[PDB]
Design a protein around this ligand. Sequence first.
Ligand code: SRM
Ligand code: SRM
Ligand code: SRM
Ligand code: SRM
Ligand code: SF4
Ligand code: SF4
Ligand code: SF4
Ligand code: SF4
Ligand code: SF4
Ligand code: SF4
Ligand code: SF4
Ligand code: SF4
Lengths: 363, 363, 417, 417
Amino acid sequence: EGVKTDFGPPYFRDLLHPVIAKNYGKWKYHEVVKPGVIKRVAESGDVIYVVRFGTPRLLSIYTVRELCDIADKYSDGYLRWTSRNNVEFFVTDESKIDDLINEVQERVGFPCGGTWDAVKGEYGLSNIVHTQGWIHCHTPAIDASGIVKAVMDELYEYFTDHKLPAMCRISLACCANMCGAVHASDIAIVGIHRTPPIPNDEAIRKTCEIPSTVAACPTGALKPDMKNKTIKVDVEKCMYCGNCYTMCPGMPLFDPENDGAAIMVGGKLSEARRMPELSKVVVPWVPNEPPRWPTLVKYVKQILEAWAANANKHERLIEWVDRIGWERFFELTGLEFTQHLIDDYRITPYFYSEFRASTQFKW
Amino acid sequence: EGVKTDFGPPYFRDLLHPVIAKNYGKWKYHEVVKPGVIKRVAESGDVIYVVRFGTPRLLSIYTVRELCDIADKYSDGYLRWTSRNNVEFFVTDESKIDDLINEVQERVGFPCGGTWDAVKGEYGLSNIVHTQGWIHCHTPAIDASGIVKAVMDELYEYFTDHKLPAMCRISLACCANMCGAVHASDIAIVGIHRTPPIPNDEAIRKTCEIPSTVAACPTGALKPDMKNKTIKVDVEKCMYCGNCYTMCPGMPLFDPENDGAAIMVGGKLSEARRMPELSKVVVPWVPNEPPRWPTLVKYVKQILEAWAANANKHERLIEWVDRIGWERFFELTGLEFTQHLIDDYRITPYFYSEFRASTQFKW
Amino acid sequence: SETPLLDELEKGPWPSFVKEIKKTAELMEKAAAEGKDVKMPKGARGLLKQLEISYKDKKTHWKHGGIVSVVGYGGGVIGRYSDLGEQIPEVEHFHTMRINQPSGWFYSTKALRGLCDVWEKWGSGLTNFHGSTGDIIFLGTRSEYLQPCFEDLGNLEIPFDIGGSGSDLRTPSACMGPALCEFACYDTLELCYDLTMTYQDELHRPMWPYKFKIKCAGCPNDCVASKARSDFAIIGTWKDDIKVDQEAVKEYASWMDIENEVVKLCPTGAIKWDGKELTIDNRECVRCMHCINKMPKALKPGDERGATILIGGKAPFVEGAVIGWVAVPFVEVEKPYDEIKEILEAIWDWWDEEGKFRERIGELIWRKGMREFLKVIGREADVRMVKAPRNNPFMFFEKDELKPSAYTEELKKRGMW
Amino acid sequence: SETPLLDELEKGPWPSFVKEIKKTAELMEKAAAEGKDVKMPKGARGLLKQLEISYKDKKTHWKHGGIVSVVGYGGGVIGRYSDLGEQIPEVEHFHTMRINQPSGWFYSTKALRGLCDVWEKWGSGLTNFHGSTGDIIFLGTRSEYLQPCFEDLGNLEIPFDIGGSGSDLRTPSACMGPALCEFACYDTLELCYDLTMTYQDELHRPMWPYKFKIKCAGCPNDCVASKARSDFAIIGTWKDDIKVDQEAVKEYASWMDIENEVVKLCPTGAIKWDGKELTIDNRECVRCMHCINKMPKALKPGDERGATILIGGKAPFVEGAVIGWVAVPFVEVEKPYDEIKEILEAIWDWWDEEGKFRERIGELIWRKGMREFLKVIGREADVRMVKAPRNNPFMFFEKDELKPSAYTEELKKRGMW
Ligand code: SRM
Ligand code: SRM
Ligand code: SRM
Ligand code: SRM
Ligand code: SF4
Ligand code: SF4
Ligand code: SF4
Ligand code: SF4
Ligand code: SF4
Ligand code: SF4
Ligand code: SF4
Ligand code: SF4
């Protein structure tokens, strides 16, 4: 016998809904019925109705189980998750969708929507991809599930309806390790520190490996203290990234009062209309204000609004900016350009700007 | 008494034609009459014609004296040079313009032309900016004056008539310190080495200050050799820039069979229609073949004709490439793309690409 | 009120995570009170209390600690220790287990229920559905429950294995591709499962200088964000002409403004509508997907399908944030994907031999150059790899490209060159 | 022939530099034979002979120079020594003197004649009109002649001083500006002259980490290529509306395709034309000049004039070639230009204090950052300085921007912060 290993996940093909399995790779066209409901028509003429709801990522197994209890009714025992942590059910009897939606929102209270129709040209706001925060992570400057909750509560009307003239991703990273799609989102909330690390000369001898810690500093702010057998931080060079704490339990830089979030903007992953683009810092620091984080939510909302109100059909935040420029951007969004926004990260090579970071080329 | 010093150049206003002095900063408009001939109309009603001629830049004092006799005859004793080293005369009597052009042509062999007309949208090729090459310089990979002559002989027809659809500047640097604006030229000829230096230890010891010669290497391919009071080169990091020989006579790297020129393309200085741009390598290397450099001249001509044949009115080389993409540029110019042209100069910061290198912004 | 700060977040129209945590404890402690075989019933409450403490403190209460793993595997379990281990004994150990997700996150009810039973038995009751990399996250168990939980996962009727962490191949992920999508240029899911299977050892046993990620996008819309979130993004594409159902375009043209919404929005102006007919100059097309996005009943990807491979994607750390750039402009994707596999393995051999401690693949490419990288994958340089040729003349030349000379003989004589 | 290779370069239509060299040789040799006072009658012939051997060898025959100067100056004369000086003694020393040009290269024949009489007496007879920076080049003399050559230059009816070289303020230069050009936004020639005279000492006596170059362009067309070829690019601009003569535009409309050659070519779509009247949304205009260049009888730069200052332009060495970037969006240019001098003097003191050996201002700014630079010239950060905000969150914050905290008190307690 002995413990079985290296057997992988279960094969996906055995786990598909009958109709889905039957028309694998033989679809004819999709059609967004209303928000949160997409109709898919197969070449063989068979019809399925994909039904999307928003989850809070973090799920209790009992919630998961009630979803299963839901799937055994309306979707033949079948369901998927999306790449923004939405739950999707598969309906084949279309006179049943408006009940699935009722029952879900009454059993687990999972909103329908998080969809978009580029055909007409009216988009919903979808889920916020996020990380761990104070729930499970040891290096967060901000809490994810808390900020997500607050923002989504404010921006609820956008998720259920197709209110926006183009697609908008909001994303969250709890620190500079930027987990998720956060470095390429239309709007990104990034956890930062504003204070340098104070060496724990004690824990450094006992735990850390000094040469590799020193080696992890992007600005060369660290140097081995030979005496002494510890690390010296040159404060003039430290931009408080917190990488050194990743390597070394002896390098905390947490200051409850000065940790907070930066807000970046104008990222894009898709090829469509214009090339993919990295996010850009437009709001240097907002504080942690648990539980409701009003400073942060007000700025996020204020950026979204200013963009909704002015952008053409399809024109995404970065494309808007392409059109009006950073001058008119800053004025319209009502934000302030300060010196913090002038890039000074020396290490990234210029030649990257000359590489084709996109599948857009001619044959 | 003592020797006069710190007195500066003669004051230009004392050296202006009376009509130019009178109408200074009081012009109504200019009009390009024909190639080489620009009419300037002052608010006073005065009209002056500015007549432009190509020059080899290197002048005999006896040529200068001839040009003076001519200026006394046609332009009241006044003349100027331009920022591309053309020479201009000032004529108040329009009936004397052709007499001037013909006498210049006869006496000194300088051709009338070098002009362009944005209004009608027809452009001449003006003079090639260039440097000392083997005539005077100790760090050249290529000759300057021989190449400019061989190229201008082949492209002559473009200097004397407005035959191109947009501006095109051709510039030449005899080595990578690229004296001139060769780094921002529609077509740039840049001399390069392809072989690493061989340290002459005796000469390094005698004459070279080691730490600053070491610090002049952009790749960190130079290290001090304390034992032998000299420098060692890691040939694997050297890309033959020659900067160490500039610093140190014991670091020569010249190889008459492997020195030659790269051809770069698509620089722009002006703001008109699109932002300025640094030139880009499209031919890694062509050999020195004095006195006529047939291989280099063939490539320059091939690139110019391909652009001129496909370009819209006002569309300079870079703007043509903005339209077609680099894929078609390479096909249409018939050039080969190799790994050489993939940028690997690591020291330059990415953030520079985020700085506004242009006077174009909104108020 | 035990948690007055967190309670404020059970309000609102959005589903509450606080409500997920309070449900977990309440029913787990109801489970253990009913005699059920549950080893960490206090797990969720302990976590709730620590989260309430953190909310007042405005600081995390998790710390560094021991490396932890199952027998046989190197990655998959992420160790976590609370710095309130004596005050809250239950969250003293709160480990994450990364459970491998099936391609495109499709699931039967049975499958999910098997996961529910195991975790309810050995862990907290909290999960992430889904993690960013794509794994099912098991959130909160002790060191001594790791192995038996994993044995039970393996022994399920629908059995799940451990995902990846550390310096290994991370769990691959895919878009929904041909399961639901009419836009898909290859079978993403099958590619994703097959790669997960082929390199089980590389995923389970970390031997590399750092982590490595693969993500599979059916087409250029990149619905799994592969170009940013994976070192090796396999994004679908085509080579022949876009299929144009001309009568279907008319349908659209009866209610849509194709001039403004489609035509004038074409990156390259490849697509035209004169009111009579649609013309696409596929020589000019960059295959950005927009027109097909606008008109999916009428427009389709061409028949000559494969994938573009973007190399280097990563978050900012050390050398900067990278959207992946072009490595392989076109590659076939057909089972058993040996052309793709040759590429991946050649990259790993070189990366393992040349990489520094914690150097991502993109940083290695930056350091060593595109020339060395391309020879390693045995591909030639291509203009499509760059947005523009280099802006400086500082080119390296290989020894063999040089003309023989007195100088090259001097270099040979000395032992350099 | 004694010069069979250079002889080939007497053929062809373009005026020959070889003819220039031979003409000098024949006529210097003739003057000396007539008993005129010519110190270097054979200089030009020697140069010819060396250039010929250089053409045969495909290599320079010049070596690194001894340092040479006129009494009282440390810059302006470049020593050049031939490696062929035993074979060709007449070019054993062949130094260059850079002679400061009048602003915009404007001369009268009396001025040029004085230069020719002096150079004929003390040098080879060979010259460059002009060197790239802008200077007249006296091409080839011996050490013992530099001082008395300089003395004659200074005693001319119209006298000429030496220009810049080494680690100094180089000879500033200017486009023709208002002398000829209806586009000029300020008096380039006057500003250039005033700077040259104000900073005679900084020019003649090198004191700095490296060289510093200033160039004056009357408007955004930049006809002296200041942004690429000077560390401090003064480029004329305006703040108010473009002046539009409507009846001149209609005169243009009658023959010129305004829509295609003007309207469609504006970078910002700021300028419309409808058959009757031309409209410019001066809030959208970025003063690129194209419409004005296109319709000079109808369109002019606005009345509130001044300059934008672009900082850091240089050739490649060390850290890469630079087109200068926006340092000062708008400065006034009114004599005696105190505000510009203020900015210059602040930059120079800071750069002399902080700069490494052979570090250019551009490089120093890259190394110290834009905040330190801006504080030095006492200006605030402006969005017009960037093409885009930063793509990473690694910002430096100043001590006083932080909230007082237990941690900041710890930092104070230790002696950091
Ligand atoms: C649901 C989801 C599939 C999956 O889980 O694998 C998805 C599904 C589709 N995406 Fe997507 N996209 C999914 C991730 C994304 C995201 C990726 C992300 O958020 O990180 C974006 C990339 C965002 C970016 O570029 O920054 C994405 C880029 C697109 C593009 C966007 C075009 C644009 O305006 O730039 C198209 C838009 C369109 O079809 O008009 C698109 C549209 C679609 C369509 C409607 C296309 C189609 O049917 O051919 C798919 C509908 C699914 C259905 O009927 O059930 N999908 N798509 C994705 C999960 C997100 C969610 O729950 O909402
Ligand atoms: C005489 C001279 C200034 C000087 O002090 O010497 C000059 C004079 C004029 N320039 Fe210039 N430019 C002069 C060098 C330049 C250069 C600098 C260089 O080449 O190093 C450029 C920057 C080049 C670049 O953009 O890379 C320059 C870019 C322009 C532009 C832009 C053309 C474009 O479409 O981008 C204008 C517009 C135009 O074409 O009318 C211009 C226009 C003009 C106008 C028409 C302005 C006017 O209202 O009179 C002047 C007449 C030129 C003509 O032939 O039509 N001038 N101009 C320059 C003579 C060069 C020569 O002998 O050919
Ligand atoms: C005479 C002149 C060439 C010509 O025939 O026109 C010249 C010639 C030399 N240049 Fe230059 N440069 C000349 C204008 C330039 C320009 C353009 C400009 O000033 O308009 C540049 C680009 C802007 C800049 O300086 O970056 C230029 C960038 C350089 C470089 C690189 C500096 C850098 O930061 O990258 C070198 C290297 C150095 O500084 O040691 C240099 C150095 C040299 C040296 C001393 C040679 C060396 O390797 O040490 C040259 C001596 C030639 C000789 O002995 O006859 N020269 N050089 C040009 C000046 C004459 C004048 O007074 O007008
Ligand atoms: C953005 C992303 C990959 C990337 O390189 O682009 C990433 C980024 C990093 N993660 Fe992660 N994590 C990413 C998925 C996740 C997820 C989501 C998941 O598991 O599906 C989690 C939550 C899992 C959990 O329950 O903890 C996650 C939690 C972690 C943990 C704990 C944080 C830490 O640094 O201590 C590891 C560290 C470890 O191995 O114990 C980590 C560590 C890191 C570090 C700091 C690497 C390290 O350990 O030094 C990241 C560096 C990236 C860089 O080079 O800048 N990352 N990381 C991942 C984004 C999603 C994706 O792959 O599409
Ligand atoms: S972004 Fe930072 S704090 Fe958040 S889960 Fe990742 S490593 Fe932890
Ligand atoms: S926080 Fe970042 S920049 Fe500061 S010392 Fe640590 S690793 Fe270096
Ligand atoms: S470009 Fe090079 S070789 Fe030519 S003059 Fe300048 S430094 Fe000398
Ligand atoms: S030639 Fe250039 S790369 Fe080579 S050692 Fe000298 S300075 Fe360095
Ligand atoms: S990336 Fe392409 S194939 Fe995959 S789900 Fe998105 S549109 Fe469909
Ligand atoms: S896929 Fe994009 S580039 Fe191609 S024709 Fe359609 S819109 Fe244009
Ligand atoms: S820079 Fe402007 S002002 Fe100067 S000559 Fe050129 S167009 Fe005229
Ligand atoms: S100067 Fe340029 S931006 Fe301004 S209206 Fe004219 S063409 Fe447009």
